[PDB]
Amino acid sequence: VTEFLKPRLVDIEQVSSTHAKVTLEPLERGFGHTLGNALRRILLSSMPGCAVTEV
């Protein structure tokens, strides 16, 4: 019962160097939204990167 269906991605689609599409087929009922929202908010709110702040 502790076991879960662990996703295995079939493809990582890339249109350009900057823009890529990643898909994971199996996942689990309700896990897809959780993972997507978590990743999206985590990489919007906090990512190690350097940008211009003062000019």
Binding site: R29, G30, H33, T34
Partner: protein, 49 residues
Amino acid sequence: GVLKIVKVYLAVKRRIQPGDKMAGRHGNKGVISKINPIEDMPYDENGTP
């Protein structure tokens, strides 16, 4: 023209299913589009979905 008649009663428990017709008393009628999971449902600050 008949010898004996056999009557058998089937009891079927009908779970609420997508496509069933749901109607309030005020007249708002609609089908159940999808059985959304409990986690997906919106929840208030108290936490009741």
